């Protein structure tokens, strides 16, 4: 019904399949998002392309490879200054990833001069630039792995990363929740981008998606009540 109502919309658009680019589905939260969104497309051939890196998903989308791309609100807000894009769906906070924190050696948060930064992480770059402001802080190209390891070493002073009270203490580290700025929470919000002039895809998403239903399905996947299907 809902499905057949969806199938009927596809009949009037030059869209066969809908291909959505999103991260590799390596958290239960990503799975619930992936599962909740596809469920909104019942009756429409809908498939995920799982592609590491927000930048390349957006580049692909811009080049016409995908109909839509999933990224964080924080990234998306930047992409829109740089490219002609549409934020077609916004899911609110805590729909994409967990909170981030500032990880450094114990009590040395006031003494930060070098920061680890993964080149592949669009959000970590933005958040590092936002948090370290007009401060003389050196950025070092490191995976968190390498950053953590190097922070333990003593060379690199900090990394902004996903948030655990105990492991950190064992390594002589500390994690600080991030100062205030609305952008940090934007990092946890899933959004769907389309090309700015792709009205068929924008309008189809508006037609098919029930935001609260998508969210409740995500919730049921995260609680283990329901298994994901994506």
The answer to whether residues 137 and 149 touch, using CB atoms and an 8 Å cutoff, is: no
Picking from 5, 4, 20, the residue whose alpha carbon sits closest to that of residue 192 is 20
Where the chain is discontinuous (C–N > 2.5 Å), the residues before each break are 163
Task: Give the tokens for residue 48.
Answer: 């995920």
- Other C-beta atoms lying within 10 Å of the C-beta of residue 156: 25
Picking from 191, 196, 187, the residue whose alpha carbon sits closest to that of residue 90 is 191
The torsion angles phi and psi of 192, rounded to 5 degrees, stand at -115, 130
Residue 160 CA to residue 186 CA, distance in Å, equals 15
Which letter does DSSP use for residue 120 in this model?
T
Picking from 35, 26, 18, the residue whose alpha carbon sits closest to that of residue 69 is 18
Write the DSSP assignment of 181-210 as a string of letters: -HHHHHTT-EEEEEETT-HHHHHHHHHH--
Q: Kindly report the CA angle at 197 between 192 and 198, in degrees rounded to 5?
A: 55
Write the DSSP assignment of 140-168 as a string of letters: EE--HHHHHHHHHHTS--EEEEE--HHHH
Task: Spell out the residues 6+ positions from residue 218 whose beta carbon is closer than 8 angstroms to its own.
Answer: 29, 32, 33, 35, 36, 95
Task: Spell out the residues 6+ positions from residue 138 whose beta carbon is closer than 8 angstroms to its own.
Answer: 113, 114, 115
Picking from 196, 194, 218, the residue whose alpha carbon sits closest to that of residue 93 is 218
- The CATH code for residues 1-96+188-230 is 3.40.190.10
Q: What residue segments make up the domains of the chain, in order of their start?
A: 1-96+188-230, 97-187
97-187 CATH fold: D-Maltodextrin-Binding Protein; domain 2 (3.40.190)
The answer to whether residues 104 and 219 touch, using CB atoms and an 8 Å cutoff, is: no
Q: Would you tell me the crossing angle of helices 122-132 and 73-82 to the nearest 10 degrees?
A: 90
Expressed in Å, this structure's resolution amounts to: 2.3
Experimental method, per PDB record? X-ray
């Amino acid at each position: 019904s809902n499905a057949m109502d969806n199938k009927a919309l596809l009949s009037h658009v030059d869209i066969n399949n809908v291909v959505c680019a999103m991260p590799l589905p390596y958290t239960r939260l990503y799975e619930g998002l992936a599962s909740g969104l596809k469920a909104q497309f019942d009756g429409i051939p809908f498939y995920y392309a799982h592609m590491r890196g927000a930048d390349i998903r957006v580049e692909c989308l811009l080049n016409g490879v995908y109909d839509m791309a999933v990224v964080s609100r924080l990234a998306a807000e930047s992409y829109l200054s740089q490219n002609n894009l549409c934020i077609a769906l916004e899911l609110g906070p805590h729909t994409y990833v967990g909170e981030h924190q500032l990880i450094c050696r114990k009590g040395e948060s006031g003494n930060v001069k070098r920061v680890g930064l993964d080149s592949r992480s669009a959000d970590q770059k933005i958040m590092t630039d936002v948090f370290f402001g007009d401060s003389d802080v050196e950025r070092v190209d490191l995976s968190y792995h390498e950053s953590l390891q190097r922070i333990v070493k003593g060379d690199v002073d900090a990394v902004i990363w996903n948030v655990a009270e105990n492991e950190l203490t064992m390594l002589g580290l500390e994690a600080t929740p991030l100062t205030d700025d609305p952008r940090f929470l934007q990092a946890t919000e899933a959004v769907v981008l389309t090309r700015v002039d792709d009205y068929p895809m924008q309008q189809l998403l508006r037609a098919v998606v029930d935001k609260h239903a998508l969210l409740a399905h995500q919730q049921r996947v995260v609680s283990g009540e329901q298994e994901p299907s994506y």
